[PDB]
C-alpha cells in the first residue's frame, strides 16, 4: 500500500533549520506530487508548497518563500522540506502529502512531524503507575493509569500491553506546567483480568530516547 | 490567495443524523474542492475530491456537493467515529488553501463519570512527589466539576485537569484531574478525596482514600 513516513519529532533551537523527511513507498514516486502542510497546534491546515520528483520543480505558498525549501531525492523516494530561520512561530505539525497531477487532492498523508522550536532543553518523563489503593472496592471493571509527568519536548506515546489494550484506553492530553508536560494514560480492564493478568503500560519519549515500562502491581 | 471560508468551527449532531458542513470559497473554484476528515491525532483523511465524488474506500455516508463558490460536505448518518474535523480546500489554484475546520461534536445522552482515585505511587513518592489522580471516565456531557478535599478541607492549589476529546466510539469525554503535592505535605494528611459533580446527579461522585489504609 502507499506509505509516507515521515522522519521523527524534532526539537529545534530557535534560529536554526530543520529538514524533515518524507519517504514514499507503494507507488511510482515520479507520477505525484509531494507537498507539504503545516498544522500549528489547534489550527487549521495550511499548504507550504509542493514538488515534482520527476524534475525537482518546485511551487511554494508565498509565505513560506525562503522559509521552507523542498527537495526530493528520486532514487530513494524521499521528499524533505527545510525549514530555516526557525521560531515557535514554526512549532508545528508538518505534514507530507501527495497529490496526483490528476485529480486534484491530497490522498495519502504522512504521519505528521512535529517540530518543536524551543531552548528549552530534552527532559524524559517520569512515569509513575496509577493503581487503586488497597482501601478500593473491586468492581467488573478496574481502571489503571500510568502518570507521565514532567517531560519536553510533547511527543509521548503510551502503550498498554503492546497495544493490545488500546480499545479501554484514555489518553488525557498533556498540559504544560512550569515548562515542562504531564499527561497521563488510562486503560479499563475487567477486573478479571487484572491483577490476575499483566498489565503494563510503556511509555516512550521519542526526544529522549526512553521508554519506562511500568507493570501495574496493587 | 483563495480563502476557503468554514464559517463555522463546530457543529453538533447526533450519531444517525444528517450533518451538512459548509465551505464557502472566496472566488469561482469551480469543482476543484475537497474535503479531509481529520481525527484527533491523526492526519487529515482524502473523503471527497472534486466538490462531489468520494475518495477511493469511502462510506457511501460521505457525500460532497457544490460548485463555484458554496460547498458543502455531508455525513447521511453520522457515526461516533466521525468525530472529526471536517476540511474544505481548494485545488483550484495555488496556493492550495484549507477552510478553518468544522469539528464535529456528537450529542448523545448524559452519562454519568466513572471514577477512579489513585494515590502517589511509592516511586513518586521516593522523589519527594506525590501526585493523586483522579479519573472521570466516560461522562457527557463535557462540563464536569472536580473539587479536591484533603481531610475534608477543599484543596485548589495544584490541581491540573485534562479532557479527552470525545470518545470516538460512545462520544462522551474524560478527564484527569491531577493534584500535585509535595511528598512532605501530602504526608501531612490523610484522607486524599476527588468530588465530582456532573449534571447527571445532585449527589457528587466521591471517590477517596486514606493514606494509612
Not at chain 1, 5 to 11: A, D, H, I, V
Not at chain 1, 142 to 155: D, I, M, Q, R
Request: neutral net charge; glycine residues 6%.
Amino acid at each position: 500500500e502507499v506509505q509516507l513516513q515521515q522522519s521523527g519529532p524534532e526539537l529545534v533551537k530557535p534560529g536554526a533549520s530543520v529538514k524533515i523527511s518524507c519517504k514514499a513507498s507503494g507507488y511510482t514516486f515520479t507520477d505525484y506530487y509531494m507537498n507539504w502542510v503545516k498544522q500549528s497546534h489547534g489550527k487549521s491546515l495550511e499548504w507550504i508548497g509542493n514538488i515534482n520528483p520527476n524534475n525537482g520543480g518546485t511551487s511554494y505558498n508565498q509565505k513560506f518563500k525562503g522559509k521552507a525549501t523542498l527537495t526530493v531525492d528520486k532514487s530513494s523516494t524521499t521528499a524533505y522540506m527545510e525549514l530555516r530561520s526557525l521560531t515557535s512561530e514554526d512549532s508545528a505539525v508538518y505534514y507530507c502529502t501527495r497529490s496526483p497531477v490528476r485529480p486534484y487532492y491530497f490522498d495519502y498523508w504522512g504521519q505528521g512531524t512535529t517540530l518543536t522550536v524551543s531552548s528549552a532543553k530534552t527532559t524524559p518523563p517520569s512515569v509513575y503507575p496509577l493503581a487503586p489503593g488497597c482501601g478500593d472496592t473491586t468492581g467488573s471493571s478496574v481502571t489503571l493509569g500510568c502518570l507521565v509527568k514532567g517531560y519536553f519536548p510533547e511527543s509521548v506515546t503510551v502503550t498498554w500491553n503492546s497495544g493490545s489494550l488500546s480499545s479501554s484506553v484514555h489518553t488525557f492530553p498533556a498540559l504544560l506546567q512550569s515548562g515542562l508536560y504531564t499527561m497521563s494514560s488510562s486503560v479499563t480492564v475487567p477486573s478479571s483480568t487484572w491483577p490476575s493478568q499483566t498489565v503494563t503500560c510503556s511509555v516512550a519519549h521519542p526526544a529522549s530516547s526512553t521508554t519506562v515500562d511500568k507493570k501495574l502491581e496493587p | 490567495d483563495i480563502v476557503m471560508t468554514q464559517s463555522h468551527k463546530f457543529m453538533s449532531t447526533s450519531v444517525g443524523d444528517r450533518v451538512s458542513i459548509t465551505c464557502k470559497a472566496s472566488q469561482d473554484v469551480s469543482t476543484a474542492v475537497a474535503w479531509y476528515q481529520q481525527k484527533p491525532g491523526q492526519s487529515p483523511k482524502l473523503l471527497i475530491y472534486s466538490a462531489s465524488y468520494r475518495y477511493t474506500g469511502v462510506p457511501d455516508r460521505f457525500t460532497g456537493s457544490g460548485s463555484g463558490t458554496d460547498f458543502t460536505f455531508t455525513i447521511s448518518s453520522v457515526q461516533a467515529e466521525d468525530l472529526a474535523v471536517y476540511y474544505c480546500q481548494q485545488h483550484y489554484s495555488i496556493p492550495r488553501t484549507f477552510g478553518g475546520g468544522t469539528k464535529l461534536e456528537i450529542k448523545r445522552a448524559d452519562a454519568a463519570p466513572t471514577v477512579s482515585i489513585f494515590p502517589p505511587s511509592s516511586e513518586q513518592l521516593t522523589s519527594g512527589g506525590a501526585s493523586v489522580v483522579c479519573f472521570l471516565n466516560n461522562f457527557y456531557p463535557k462540563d464536569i466539576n472536580v473539587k479536591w478535599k484533603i481531610d475534608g478541607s477543599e484543596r485548589q492549589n495544584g490541581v491540573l485537569n485534562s479532557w479527552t476529546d470525545q470518545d470516538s466510539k460512545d462520544s462522551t469525554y474524560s478527564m484527569s484531574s491531577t493534584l500535585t503535592l509535595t511528598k512532605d505535605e501530602y504526608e501531612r494528611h490523610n484522607s486524599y478525596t476527588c468530588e465530582a459533580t456532573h449534571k447527571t446527579s445532585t449527589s457528587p461522585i466521591v471517590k477517596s482514600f486514606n493514606r494509612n489504609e
